[PDB]
Design a protein around this ligand. Structure first.
Ligand SMILES: *[C@@H]1O[C@H](CO)[C@@H](O[C@@H]2O[C@H](CO)[C@@H](O)[C@H](O)[C@H]2NC(C)=O)[C@H](O)[C@H]1NC(C)=O
Ligand SMILES: *[C@@H]1O[C@H](CO)[C@@H](O[C@@H]2O[C@H](CO)[C@@H](O)[C@H](O)[C@H]2NC(C)=O)[C@H](O)[C@H]1NC(C)=O
Ligand SMILES: CC(=O)N[C@@H]1[C@@H](O)[C@H](O)[C@@H](CO)O[C@H]1O
Ligand SMILES: CC(=O)N[C@@H]1[C@@H](O)[C@H](O)[C@@H](CO)O[C@H]1O
Ligand SMILES: CC(=O)N[C@@H]1[C@@H](O)[C@H](O)[C@@H](CO)O[C@H]1O
Ligand SMILES: CC(=O)N[C@@H]1[C@@H](O)[C@H](O)[C@@H](CO)O[C@H]1O
Ligand code: NA
Ligand code: NA
Lengths: 266, 266
């Protein structure tokens, strides 16, 4: 089956996009990125935002652990940095510490008593105080024997305006390169040329990281690659890169109904 | 000040984008569109999704009423239709009835004991059972003496693939035409030509509805129009349309920090 990852958490409620456990139990995925954590440039404690899934999300603990015991990695995505004009000391250091204590220590945090597998950073502005490359270095330097995987979700334009610094730390394990919404590098009908060139650029410029092609599971989004096109044209070309890792599915909501991941070649 | 509307509800928590009351109290807006209600093609009761603002959102009642007593209209946006392959009878009729009972009757619904001012529909796929134009007609035909405003948020491409049928009912009071993210009709630096042509097309083809230009409040989104450009170039041209209504701000989160609406001409 290879490496198929998926985004979950912003697809509504359990009744719209299914529970996290449902996603894991489906067997389609070996890694889930939870969307998303809101962080504060002024050092306020982060706010978890899993939409209509839960407000008290501590009961997700058992679902996270179920996933992990099925060998599925669970990463939490930082999706929003609330800016401040205030000059505040130690914001990045303090966030790294908050994350370590609340998600990577088995202690009672927002997702219950878990050790998550890592942190993803979305392609969004950082703060005047909070800096993503600094955060990545701090997390990798964490006082723990646990493996904390670090990743980013850049758009397919290289370099990514928001994440290039974090990428150039050379400390990201995975990149979920987004080939959806309107960008010059998406697939369009009968035209993979820009996507191929972007994949060449990403894989060659970030040889230290595993590169996922993040694709939409629905034909209602720009960048959609029909499964036969993905299997017979796209994958044969992009898999020539030694650091091509697989496909990231945007997102569990669309995939739950479309069963796009089911149609990807073995 | 004219007509300035804003989207609120998907900007995170109260600490990231402020409470609904805060938005109303700011005095920047005369209409707020709440994002968003999830509806079900199989006829399941809708799920309210105001992200990390609340799960039990009934306590928003007092904030809604505060807004309304300040002459601010509150509309709820349908943002997501969860599809089904099942053929289910009366889905649209039943949704109209659910909305009437739960948001337009002063009874104890998901937002408490309110009479909302109306419903907006996002530019998203409808269902195999649930149909937007049918929903608009049903809501307008509601057994009530209350005014229910009906609107849609089409993208700037005319016709809108998802909402054109709803628009052609001629029963929409407002259109929030979205000139952001990547589309051929957005403003780009020193180039309003496509936006002007789109505004001509929207205003001339939908003379029966008031047309808002929906614009991003942050320079970090495609389509951003610096306030001086908006005031001295854009508004003088587009305001020549008799049905040009004003500016819809995407969104309260960005506007809270950027104070974009504050910079729009009187
Ligand atoms: C920081 O990154 C380094 C390098 O990827 C990680 O170090 C590896 O850790 C694994 C398991 O602990 C070992 O098998 C490797 O031999 C290590 N490699 C090197 C070069 O030291 C380290 O674990 C990361 N830190 C965290 C907190 O995950
Ligand atoms: C359906 O649309 C019609 C037309 O806009 C609305 O009828 C208007 O109602 C207002 C206030 O009740 C009156 O001042 C107008 O004279 C009416 N116009 C016409 C042509 O009848 C009607 O209110 C809408 N239905 C709902 C539930 O809002
Ligand atoms: C495979 C896996 O990740 N197992 C985790 C374990 O590491 C952790 O000690 C525990 C308590 O938080 O949750 C487990 O089930
Ligand atoms: C607060 C903010 O917007 N910071 C941005 C940062 O996100 C971006 O990666 C960088 C690129 O050089 O430019 C900064 O201005
Ligand atoms: C101006 C306004 O909309 N006022 C509303 C009123 O119509 C409604 O009867 C009441 C109870 O639900 O909430 C009010 O304050
Ligand atoms: C379930 C679904 O996707 N329905 C779409 C509808 O949203 C769209 O407005 C219409 C345009 O003709 O095409 C239908 O296939
Ligand atoms: Na879709
Ligand atoms: Na921004």
């Amino acid at each position: 089956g290879g490496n198929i990852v998926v985004y979950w958490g912003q697809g509504g409620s359990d009744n719209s996009e299914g529970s996290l456990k449902e996603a894991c139990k489906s067997g389609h995925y070996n890694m889930i990125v939870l969307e998303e954590l809101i962080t504060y440039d002024n050092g306020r404690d982060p706010d978890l935002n899993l939409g209509a899934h839960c407000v008290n999300c501590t009961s997700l603990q058992q679902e996270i652990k179920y996933c992990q015991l099925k060998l599925i990695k669970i990463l939490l995505q930082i999706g929003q940095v609330t800016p401040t004009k205030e000059d505040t000391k130690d914001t990045t250091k303090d966030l790294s510490q908050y994350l370590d204590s609340n998600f990577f220590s088995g202690k009672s945090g927002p997702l219950g008593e878990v050790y998550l597998d890592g942190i993803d950073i979305a392609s969004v502005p950082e703060g005047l105080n909070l800096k993503f490359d600094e955060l990545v270095q701090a997390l990798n330097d964490s006082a723990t024997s646990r493996r904390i995987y670090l990743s980013a979700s850049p758009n397919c334009v290289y370099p990514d305006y928001y994440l290039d610094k974090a990428i150039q730390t050379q400390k990201l394990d995975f990149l979920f390169v987004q080939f959806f919404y309107a960008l010059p590098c998406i697939y369009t009908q009968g035209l993979p040329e820009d996507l191929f060139q972007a994949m060449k650029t990403w894989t060659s410029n970030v040889p230290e990281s595993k590169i996922f092609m993040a694709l939409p599971a629905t034909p209602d989004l720009n960048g959609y690659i029909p499964p036969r096109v993905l299997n017979k044209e796209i994958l044969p070309a992009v898999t020539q890169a030694s650091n091509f890792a697989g496909v990231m599915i945007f997102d569990r909501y669309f995939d739950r109904f479309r069963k796009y991941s089911s149609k990807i070649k073995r």
